[PDB]
Ligand binder design. Structure first.
Ligand SMILES: Nc1ncnc2c1ncn2[C@@H]1O[C@H](COP(=O)(O)OP(=O)(O)O)[C@@H](O)[C@H]1O
Ligand SMILES: Nc1ncnc2c1ncn2[C@@H]1O[C@H](COP(=O)(O)OP(=O)(O)O)[C@@H](O)[C@H]1O
Lengths: 48, 157, 605
């Protein structure tokens, strides 16, 4: 839920902007929706 | 030598992901019944679809509406955080930086970086962005560290 | 010409004369040209014993002045530009009155809807004025074209002449005149051709395709053909970001004449061309200087602390590392690039390697440079899918049956290259860099091509310690994981450490928080005037220092942590010369060598 909102996109005056987006890693043995949870995200999120 | 990646990949996992979640639990007798009986209630008898419809009468958002809400709140808001909330984060970083050094002082070789701190400043503010708020407060931040440390407990093991 | 001018033309002229009477900035500028040509004519004429006749019009000056003449150039240029040049061609005759050719126009500013990408340049508004932005994608071999032909009638010693007109010399569809090249006189005599009493002009066409970052990515490129008359031919090259203005004529008569479908040949007559600058482009930023902007530099240049503040102002987004970005600032300045009489050129560009713990700014610092160096290109190293950053494949299907194209480093011929993930980049490039670094020449020996091309350019390397992390209790060579010659080829190697602490680490939070909650545009103008005007000669007050230190380190450092070579003698000269450029010093001084030493003390120990 915190991911799809983006974040603090910051056009600093030197141009060295910082990403607003966040990166999340799922790790585990197979099962447990680690692949499934992306599939629904590809429905809800804009331009997924 | 080996096919595919190499241990070098130990960096890009811990340095460049803002959260890493490690999600295995061990065949608990009631859990594999709880999930199973829920998963039966998926495949037919549609009780979750029924529940999600009833909860669309109750308190849930339907997929198409959540998307439009996301795109609205994504575009409409350009938030910021107050220095009142900001001081809590250094108060967190200096302690976690000071503590876990001991575990690399003990050469356990596992990290604690401003890449993670700069992630927290984003998870805090996105959590505050759900609200349609230009501003953020410890009311959100104390939840973000609680969410974050679920990741550090996975890094250490 | 031969027809009698109607008031629909006579008005357009005299109406435009009241504009130029109002805005003297154009009357004195055309005068300023014939000032320049006559000075050169006098220089040629009166010592041995031009500028290409066009002016740029600010369209902001028309809007408030003549609203219907604004819409005329945009909507009906073929009826408003030929008379405006006909005014200027008699304004030019009015300004001069020395004894004794065409005069032409160009434009600048905002065109509203008429400025559009060639993705949306369409067969609406053909005849209207257009502006287009994109990449120049190829250029035609600049052919000479006939206009006047001259002949000799040897039976009499008379001369005869003929003049040609075509689809690209008038905006209006003049009646075609397919005149025949005269091989026989009206009387029937023979003829010969007086080549060079005849006159010629350059023809070129260049094809522009939509700029790829604005493009709705995934789709195919779409492109249109621009024809350039004599002037602008020299000022386009493939791959640069270019804005053109002109008339999107739709000429010929395909299908409806002759016999049969594909419609009319559509193209732009280019009346203005500008190169422009975007990220990773083959042209410099080239900001103009006022006589005021130079004044601020000269206020600064004699203050005995500029290099400390200037070194800091680069990168407020980053904490610390002043001791490094000092040198990266010196890379922008560079050396003097001395070229010796009857003997090979000698390197000026200083090439820098960044390495350290992967937490650090290595990947991010380079996006200051790429955003704020005069000219830069960024390469991932691995992923230079051509020959490399330098050379290219070479084949053709067009009329000439060969062509050449240049890699990133040949394109960046004087400025900067940002190389990152440097030790991913394979041996195939590394051994090619060993060719470059201190020779700044590139050679290739394909089937047809056996020739040398220049690459007088400067490099930042960014690298990672192969073991994933480093600390100085682990022997300090093997972590570099590169051939010892590259550790020589690069001039300054900086090792950045983050074995964690708390004391320094304390302040960082509030600085980052302050960073989520001197200046850049002056540095560009500070660097280019320094680069252009200043060429410091050495001075004996500093020539001794570089001998004292270099000769000591070869006793000491060959007994300690790093190699020292005659290569690292010259790096002392360059760095001293660079700091003198920071001083704008007409000559080197001892202080600059003490700075050169200091940077190497930090870099080595
Ligand atoms: N938490 C869960 N709830 C319901 N079904 C689950 C859950 N975790 C795994 N599954 C089952 O796992 C299957 C999806 O496998 P998945 O875990 O996406 O593959 P992978 O192991 O490659 O990630 C689905 O058929 C689903 O029924
Ligand atoms: N010295 C530093 N000061 C402030 N931020 C830094 C520093 N070093 C790295 N960062 C952070 O790292 C991010 C940039 O990624 P970086 O660490 O440069 O990747 P790489 O390791 O590939 O160079 C920025 O968000 C920046 O905040």
């Amino acid at each position: 839920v915190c991911l799809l909102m983006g974040g603090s996109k910051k056009i600093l005056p030197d141009g060295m902007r910082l990403r607003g987006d966040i990166n999340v890693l799922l790790l585990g043995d197979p099962g447990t929706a680690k692949s499934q949870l992306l599939k629904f995200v590809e429905k809800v999120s804009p331009i997924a | 030598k080996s096919p595919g990646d190499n241990i070098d990949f130990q960096t890009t996992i811990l340095s460049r992901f803002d959260m890493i979640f490690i999600v295995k639990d061990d065949h608990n007798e009631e859990r594999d019944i709880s999930i199973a009986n829920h998963v039966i209630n998926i495949h037919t008898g549609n009780a979750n679809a029924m529940q999600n419809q009833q909860e669309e009468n109750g308190s849930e958002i339907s997929i198409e509406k959540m998307k439009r809400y996301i795109t609205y709140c994504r575009l409409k808001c350009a938030p910021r955080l107050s220095p009142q909330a900001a001081e809590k984060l250094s108060s967190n970083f200096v302690t976690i930086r000071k503590q876990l050094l001991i575990n690399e002082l003990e050469s356990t070789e596992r990290p604690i970086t401003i890449r993670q701190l700069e992630a927290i400043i984003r998870i805090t503010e996105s959590l505050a962005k759900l609200e349609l708020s230009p501003i953020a407060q410890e009311r959100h931040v104390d939840e973000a560290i609680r969410l974050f440390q679920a990741s550090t407990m996975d890094a250490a093991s | 010409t031969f027809f009698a001018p109607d008031a629909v033309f006579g008005d357009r002229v005299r109406r435009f004369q009241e504009f130029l009477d109002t805005f003297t900035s154009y009357r004195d500028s055309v005068r300023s040209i014939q000032v320049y040509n006559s000075n050169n004519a006098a220089n040629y004429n009166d010592d041995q014993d031009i500028l290409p006749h066009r002016i740029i019009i600010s369209l902001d000056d028309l809007r408030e002045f003549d609203r219907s003449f604004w819409s005329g150039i945009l909507v009906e240029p073929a009826y408003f530009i030929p008379p405006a040049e006909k005014a200027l061609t008699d304004l030019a005759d009015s300004m001069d009155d020395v004894p004794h050719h065409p005069w032409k126009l160009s434009f600048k500013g905002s065109f509203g809807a008429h400025a559009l990408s060639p993705r949306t340049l369409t067969a609406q508004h053909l005849n209207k004025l257009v502006s287009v932005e994109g990449i120049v994608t190829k250029t035609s071999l600049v052919r000479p074209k006939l206009i006047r032909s001259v002949h000799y009638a040897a039976k009499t010693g008379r001369f005869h002449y003929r003049d040609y007109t075509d689809a690209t010399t008038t905006l209006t569809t003049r009646i075609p005149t397919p005149a025949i090249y005269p091989t026989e006189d009206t009387e029937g005599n023979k003829l010969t051709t007086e080549y060079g009493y005849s006159t010629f002009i350059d023809h070129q066409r260049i094809t522009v395709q939509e700029m790829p970052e604005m493009a709705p990515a995934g789709q195919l490129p779409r492109s249109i053909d621009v024809i350039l008359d004599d002037d602008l031919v020299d000022k386009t090259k493939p791959g640069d970001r270019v804005n053109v203005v002109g008339v999107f004529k739709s000429l010929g008569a395909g299908g409806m004449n002759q016999s049969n479908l594909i419609g009319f040949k559509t193209l732009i007559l280019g009346n203005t061309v500008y190169p422009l600058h975007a990220r990773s482009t083959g042209v410099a930023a080239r900001q103009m200087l006022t006589d005021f902007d130079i004044r601020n530099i000269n206020k600064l240049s004699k203050k005995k602390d500029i290099f400390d503040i200037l070194s800091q102002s680069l990168a407020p987004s980053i904490y610390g590392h002043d001791h490094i970005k000092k040198a990266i600032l010196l890379m922008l300045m560079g050396g003097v690039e001395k070229n010796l009489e009857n003997g090979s050129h000698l390197r000026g560009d200083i090439n820098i390697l960044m390495v350290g713990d992967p937490s650090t700014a290595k990947s991010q610092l380079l996006r200051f440079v790429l955003n704020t160096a005069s000219l830069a290109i960024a390469t991932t190293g691995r992923g230079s899918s051509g020959v490399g950053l330098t050379a290219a494949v070479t084949t053709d299907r067009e009329t000439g049956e060969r062509r050449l194209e240049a890699g990133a480093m040949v394109l960046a011929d004087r400025g900067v290259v940002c190389i990152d993930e440097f030790d991913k980049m394979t041996d195939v490039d590394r051994v090619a860099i060993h060719e470059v670094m201190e020779q700044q020449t590139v050679t290739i020996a394909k089937a047809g091509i056996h020739t040398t091309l220049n690459a007088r350019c400067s490099v930042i390397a960014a690298a990672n310690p192969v073991f994933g992390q480093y600390d100085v209790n682990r022997d300090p060579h093997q972590n570099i994981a590169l051939p010892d010659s590259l550790l020589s080829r690069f001039d300054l190697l900086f090792v950045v450490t983050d074995d964690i602490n708390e004391i320094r680490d304390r302040s960082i939070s509030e600085h980052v928080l302050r960073t989520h909650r001197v200046t850049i545009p002056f540095l560009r103008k500070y660097v280019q005037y320094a680069k252009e005007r200043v060429i410091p000669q050495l001075t004996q007050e500093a020539i001794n220092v570089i001998v004292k230190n270099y000769t000591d380190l070869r006793n000491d450092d060959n007994t300690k942590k790093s190699p020292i070579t005659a290569r690292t003698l010259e790096t002392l000269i360059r760095l001293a010369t660079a700091h003198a450029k920071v001083r704008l010093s007409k000559t080197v001084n001892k202080v600059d060598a003490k700075v050169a030493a200091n940077l190497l003390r930090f870099a080595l120990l």
